[PDB]
Structure 1
C-alpha cells in the first residue's frame, strides 16, 4: 500500500534488501499487486553486483522449493515469477 501511494504521488521508492531470501517473496507479492493499480509504467530496478547470479541461482534450484513450485517445474516453467517479470521487462537487473 505504501509503495503504491508513494509511486502515485510521483516520488521515488528505495528498498534495501539482501539480494536473496525475502526479496523473492516480496517480488511475488509485487508482481501480483502491480496490476491491481495498473502501475505498469513505473519500472523496477534491481541494482547489485550479484543480482543476475542470484536470480539465476534461485531459478535453477527446484528440488528445494515448496511442493507448489516443484509442481510448477514438473509443468515445464520456471518456478519463480521474477523470471516472467524479467521476460516482460518490468524488472531490470543491473
Structure 2
C-alpha cells in the first residue's frame, strides 16, 4: 500500500533487500496487487550482480517447495510467478 501510494504521486520507491530472501514473497504480492491497483505501467527494477542467478535458482528449485507449489511440476509450468512478470516485461532485472 505504501509503495502504491508513493508511485501514484509520481515518486520513486527504493526497497533495500537481499537478492534471494523475502524479495520473492513481496514480489508475488506485488504482482497480485498492481493488477487491481492499476499500476502495471510502472517498472519493477531488480539490480544486483546475482539477479538473474537468483531468479533462475529460485525457479529451478521446484522440488524444494510445499505440496501446493511443487504440484506445478506435473503440468509444464515454472513454480514462481515472477517468470510471468518477466514475460509480460513487468519485472526487469539488471
Q: Under TM normalisation by the shorter chain, which class is it?
A: over 0.9
Unmatched 5+ residue regions in structure 1? none
1:6, 1:56 → 2: CA distance?
Answer: 30
Shift of 1:37: 1.1
2:38, 2:75 → 1: CA distance?
Answer: 29
Count the aligned residue pairs: 94
Larger relative helix fraction = 1
User: TM-score w.r.t. structure 2 length?
Assistant: 0.97
Shift of 1:21: 1.8
Structure 1 match to 2:3: 3
The 4+ residue runs of structure 1 with deviation greater than 3 A are: none
Unmatched 5+ residue regions in structure 2? none
1:19, 1:74 → 2: CA distance?
Answer: 28
Range with greater deviation from structure 2 (69-78 or 53-62): 69-78
- What is the CA deviation profile of residues 61-84 of structure 1, one whole-angstrom value per residue up to 9, with x for unaligned ones? 011111111112212100000111
- What is the CA deviation profile of residues 38-69 of structure 1, one whole-angstrom value per residue up to 9, with x for unaligned ones? 11110100000000001001100011111111
Range with greater deviation from structure 2 (76-85 or 66-75): 66-75
User: TM-score w.r.t. structure 1 length?
Assistant: 0.97
CA RMSD of aligned residues (A): 0.7
